[PDB]
Amino acid sequence: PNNDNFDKLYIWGVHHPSTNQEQTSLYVQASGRVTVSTRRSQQTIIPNIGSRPW
Amino acid sequence: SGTLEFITEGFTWTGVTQNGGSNACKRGPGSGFFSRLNWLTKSGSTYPVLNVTMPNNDNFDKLYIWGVHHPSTNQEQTSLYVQASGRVTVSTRRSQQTIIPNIGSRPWVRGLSSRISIYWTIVKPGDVLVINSNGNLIAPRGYFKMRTGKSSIMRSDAPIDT
Amino acid sequence: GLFGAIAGFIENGWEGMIDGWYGFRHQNSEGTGQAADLKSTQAAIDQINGKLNRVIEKTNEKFHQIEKEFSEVEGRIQDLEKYVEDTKIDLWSYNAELLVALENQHTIDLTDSEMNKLFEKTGRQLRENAEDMGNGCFKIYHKCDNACIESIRNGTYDHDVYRDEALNNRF
Amino acid sequence: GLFGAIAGFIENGWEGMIDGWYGFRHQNSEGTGQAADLKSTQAAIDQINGKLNRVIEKTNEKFHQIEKEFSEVEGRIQDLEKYVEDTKIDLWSYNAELLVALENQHTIDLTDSEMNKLFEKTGRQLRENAEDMGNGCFKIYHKCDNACIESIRNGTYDHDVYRDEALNNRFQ
Amino acid sequence: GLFGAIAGFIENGWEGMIDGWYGFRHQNSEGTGQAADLKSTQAAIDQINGKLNRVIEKTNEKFHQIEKEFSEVEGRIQDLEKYVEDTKIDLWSYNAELLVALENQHTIDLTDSEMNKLFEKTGRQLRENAEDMGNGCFKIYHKCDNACIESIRNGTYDHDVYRDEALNNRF
Amino acid sequence: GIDCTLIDALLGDPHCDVFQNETWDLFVERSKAFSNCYPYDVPDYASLRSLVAS
Numbered sequence: 055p056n057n058d059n060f061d062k063l064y065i066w067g068v069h070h071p072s073t074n075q076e077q078t079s080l081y082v083q084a085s086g087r088v089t090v091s092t093r094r095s096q097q098t099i100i101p102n103i104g105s106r107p108w
Numbered sequence: 109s110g111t112l113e114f115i116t117e118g119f120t121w122t123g124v125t126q127n128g129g130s131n132a133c134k135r136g137p138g139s140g141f142f143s144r145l146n147w148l149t150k151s152g153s154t155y156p157v158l159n160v161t162m163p164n165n166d167n168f169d170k171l172y173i174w175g176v177h178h179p180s181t182n183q184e185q186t187s188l189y190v191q192a193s194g195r196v197t198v199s200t201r202r203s204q205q206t207i208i209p210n211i212g213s214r215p216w217v218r219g220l221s222s223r224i225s226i227y228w229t230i231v232k233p234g235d236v237l238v239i240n241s242n243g244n245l246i247a248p249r250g251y252f253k254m255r256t257g258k259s260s261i262m263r264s265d266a267p268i269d270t
Numbered sequence: 271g272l273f274g275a276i277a278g279f280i281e282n283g284w285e286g287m288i289d290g291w292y293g294f295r296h297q298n299s300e301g302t303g304q305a306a307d308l309k310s311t312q313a314a315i316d317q318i319n320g321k322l323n324r325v326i327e328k329t330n331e332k333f334h335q336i337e338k339e340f341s342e343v344e345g346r347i348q349d350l351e352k353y354v355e356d357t358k359i360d361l362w363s364y365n366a367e368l369l370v371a372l373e374n375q376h377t378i379d380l381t382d383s384e385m386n387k388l389f390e391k392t393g394r395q396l397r398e399n400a401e402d403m404g405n406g407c408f409k410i411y412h413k414c415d416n417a418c419i420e421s422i423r424n425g426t427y428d429h430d431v432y433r434d435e436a437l438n439n440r441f
Numbered sequence: 442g443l444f445g446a447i448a449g450f451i452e453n454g455w456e457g458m459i460d461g462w463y464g465f466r467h468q469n470s471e472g473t474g475q476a477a478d479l480k481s482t483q484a485a486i487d488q489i490n491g492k493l494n495r496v497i498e499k500t501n502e503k504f505h506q507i508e509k510e511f512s513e514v515e516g517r518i519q520d521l522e523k524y525v526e527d528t529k530i531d532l533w534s535y536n537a538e539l540l541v542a543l544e545n546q547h548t549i550d551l552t553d554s555e556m557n558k559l560f561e562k563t564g565r566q567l568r569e570n571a572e573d574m575g576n577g578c579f580k581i582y583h584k585c586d587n588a589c590i591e592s593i594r595n596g597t598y599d600h601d602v603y604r605d606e607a608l609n610n611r612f613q
Numbered sequence: 614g615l616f617g618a619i620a621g622f623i624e625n626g627w628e629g630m631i632d633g634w635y636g637f638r639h640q641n642s643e644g645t646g647q648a649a650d651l652k653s654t655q656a657a658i659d660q661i662n663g664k665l666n667r668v669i670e671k672t673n674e675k676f677h678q679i680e681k682e683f684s685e686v687e688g689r690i691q692d693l694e695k696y697v698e699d700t701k702i703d704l705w706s707y708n709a710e711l712l713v714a715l716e717n718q719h720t721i722d723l724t725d726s727e728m729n730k731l732f733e734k735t736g737r738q739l740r741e742n743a744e745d746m747g748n749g750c751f752k753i754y755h756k757c758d759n760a761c762i763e764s765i766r767n768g769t770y771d772h773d774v775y776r777d778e779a780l781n782n783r784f
Numbered sequence: 785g786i787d788c789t790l791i792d793a794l795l796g797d798p799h800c801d802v803f804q805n806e807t808w809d810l811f812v813e814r815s816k817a818f819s820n821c822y823p824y825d826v827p828d829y830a831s832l833r834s835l836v837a838s
């Protein structure tokens with residue numbers, strides 16, 4: 055809860071693994087999801103599996 | 109950019125069928141497709157995980173045009189791509205896009221309830237393109253050379269003259 | 271105008287003065303005649319052309335800009351494209367309006383001035399040999415033939431030559 | 442002003458001239474008096490009403506625009522909306538400042554001009570019968586009763602009638 | 614200029630007048646001399662510093678704005694940022710051009726005016742004792758020593774003192 | 785708009801159903817407006833509000 059009298063900025067993130075093997079190794083679930091919300095806003099993020107450039 | 113100069117690159121697409129076409133897009137008498145795109149489908153009874161790279165060793169920006177097929181039915185999805193759900197991921201060293209196709213009908217257009225969605229990716233000198241898909245990828249055949257300058261576009265029905 | 275010459279003590283323009291903007295009309299013992307004054311005429315013309323050329327100089331060159339017409343409702347981004355463009359046009363339109371009001375006022379006042387300046391110059395040459403009748407005309411108080419008038423017009427009038435004659439006639 | 446009449450050779454205004462902007466004050470053998478000059482007062486008035494009506498002419502009509510207040514931080518798009526508006530306001534604010542600065546300079550000079558123009562007309566009617574004392578007053582070198590002054594004020598003064606009398610007074 | 618004094622009936626400026634903007638040159642029975650006129654000079658100076666102080670008054674203070682240079686092609690939103698800024702710059706650039714054009718014309722015209730006003734004042738003091746030679750000089754028709762000239766320059770010349778003498782000489 | 789935002793009237797939040805099929809040159813939203821139906825958000829809320837209002 056924000057029980058202060060100023061706005062709070064939260065910084066967070068979503069990991070995109072390179073393989074299905076990596077995803078399950080880290081997170082067990084084959085596909086994840088991150089949802090961060092307030093009382094009148096919401097952001098839901100689905101991670102994306104695959105190789106990117108090294 | 110002011111030009112449509114296009115440069116074919118020798119992408120290798122192992123374990124898929126290339127050059128897909130449709131009677132919605134005839135080229136001469138037979139089925140065909142957009143000239144700058146490459147509709148990939150299964151080969152035999154499989155569609156492997158595509159994972160290909162193309163470095164930019166030039167000293168200009170390259171524009172890659174690519175796409176994602178959205179089939180209208182599950183029968184179609186699996187018929188083309190084997191996988192029940194496909195995925196297309198295209199990225200550079202500082203950008204990434206992953207698109208999951210969506211099965212279902214859209215309004216019937218030129219015989220088709222299916223659709224293609226077009227995306228673009230720019231790769232600067234010293235950067236690299238990586239393409240990773242296990243289905244539904246409408247692949248680029250190469251890139252457009254990007255220029256900067258005074259070029260533009262206008263909507264008009266006025267005739268040209270000398 | 272500010273100087274009160276054009277549309278002022280000069281009662282009207284001369285439709286018949288077709289080879290100059292400003293000039294002289296006279297009556298003397300050899301009849302009457304007319305001549306444009308080139309220096310004043312040329313003074314008004316040069317200022318107006320200088321001004322005109324400043325105004326019609328150098329349009330801006332623009333190439334790729336923004337879309338200004340839209341075939342679909344889109345909301346927030348389109349509103350902003352439309353607001354930016356709408357604002358720009360009103361600003362330029364104001365500038366255009368303002369530019370001509372000031373220019374035209376200034377074109378009018380400078381031409382009035384040239385009239386007044388020509389008149390004052392004529393008065394000064396004449397010294398004590400003439401009186402301003404108040405309608406842009408001078409009553410010249412001495413015999414003054416065509417060569418004499420022309421001597422006034424070309425700026426070589428020698429007031430001393432006529433002074434004795436003129437003062438006797440005035441007073 | 443540019444013409445040097447108001448706040449110039451006319452040393453001050455007349456708080457007592459309340460039925461005109463410009464006018465005449467006189468002294469003669471029948472006493473003294475005051476009269477508004479009708480043409481010049483009206484000449485000045487029409488230009489000022491003219492400019493003013495141009496200035497107060499035609500506000501713009503606007504309807505749906507953009508939001509200009511925001512209850513949440515949003516970044517790039519809000520920055521741009523606020524910048525466009527802020528920019529618009531500063532430009533208009535500049536135009537407004539400039540417009541009145543220019544008008545007022547022009548309003549002051551045109552009023553000075555009418556004074557100067559009225560003064561010049563008076564001099565011209567009088568020909569050789571009067572001299573400019575240099576403070577916006579003319580010395581008239583002949584007997585000049587109320588009908589004569591009024592003849593000057595209404596523009597029908599006949600300088601020739603008085604010239605013999607006047608020149609004699611000026612030069613002899 | 615509008616009044617025709619500077620670059621007009623006054624044939625040229627005086628490079629040798631280094632202690633004033635406007636002034637007097639004279640010749641009389643005691644020789645010749647020069648003096649700046651402080652009031653007219655100061656009148657011009659006060660107006661020009663006033664306009665100038667108005668022009669350089671109060672720059673705007675701005676803090677967080679928009680990005681105006683971009684390292685990547687982005688399309689629609691960037692076009693608008695660039696269009697908004699490009700537009701803003703052209704409007705201000707226009708204002709800057711116009712502001713100085715109007716001011717400079719007005720600066721030129723007001724100085725011509727002060728010249729013309731000083732000249733007219735001198736004529737008025739002199740009454741019937743002098744004649745305008747038409748070149749910004751007055752011919753004074755009476756003996757007029759240095760104290761007399763100074764009486765003119767400082768505004769106490771008493772025309773009545775010299776009128777009999779001057780008129781005899783004029784006429 | 786009284787107790788209603790334009791969007792609550794649009795969706796048909798019950799205490800706002802008074803505003804059904806209504807028209808306006810200028811819609812006035814009051815700071816006291818409140819929602820009283822299923823909790824919701826609108827992606828690009830600002831645009832929908834704008835395009836309906838217009």
Ligand SMILES: *[C@@H]1O[C@H](CO)[C@@H](O[C@@H]2O[C@H](CO)[C@@H](O)[C@H](O)[C@H]2NC(C)=O)[C@H](O)[C@H]1NC(C)=O
Nearest residue numbers: 111112113114115116117143166250251252253
């Ligand atoms: C459009 O322009 C590109 C670039 O010039 C052309 O690509 C060339 O093709 C020739 C023939 O195969 C090759 O030898 C060159 O190596 C290519 N140039 C480059 C820089 O890649 C292309 O042929 C043109 N497209 C068409 C259809 O005319």
Ligand SMILES: *[C@@H]1O[C@H](CO)[C@@H](O[C@@H]2O[C@H](CO)[C@@H](O)[C@H](O)[C@H]2NC(C)=O)[C@H](O)[C@H]1NC(C)=O
Nearest residue numbers: 180181182211212213214215216217219220221
């Ligand atoms: C979903 O419904 C739409 C609308 O009825 C179907 O689109 C029709 O497809 C038929 C068969 O080809 C066409 O003949 C019609 O022209 C289409 N109707 C309309 C109104 O567009 C669509 O086939 C359905 N999707 C699925 C997978 O059943």
Ligand SMILES: *[C@@H]1O[C@H](CO)[C@@H](O)[C@H](O)[C@H]1NC(C)=O
Nearest residue numbers: 073105107108159160161238
């Ligand atoms: C896919 O290709 C890229 C580019 O060569 C390579 O770096 C990466 O290791 C590959 N990914 C996998 C899991 O094979």
Ligand SMILES: *[C@@H]1O[C@H](CO)[C@@H](O)[C@H](O)[C@H]1NC(C)=O
Nearest residue numbers: 416417418420421424425426
């Ligand atoms: C001006 O005009 C007169 C009469 O035509 C002529 O005699 C005289 O030479 C002219 N003056 C000059 C110097 O051109």
Ligand SMILES: *[C@@H]1O[C@H](CO)[C@@H](O)[C@H](O)[C@H]1NC(C)=O
Nearest residue numbers: 587588589591592595596597
């Ligand atoms: C000017 O004033 C006189 C005195 O009042 C009057 O008699 C005369 O009619 C006036 N002139 C004209 C033509 O108005």
Ligand SMILES: *[C@@H]1O[C@H](CO)[C@@H](O)[C@H](O)[C@H]1NC(C)=O
Nearest residue numbers: 760761763764765767768769
């Ligand atoms: C002007 O100059 C004269 C000569 O010096 C002097 O006597 C006179 O007082 C001056 N006038 C005034 C009031 O300054």
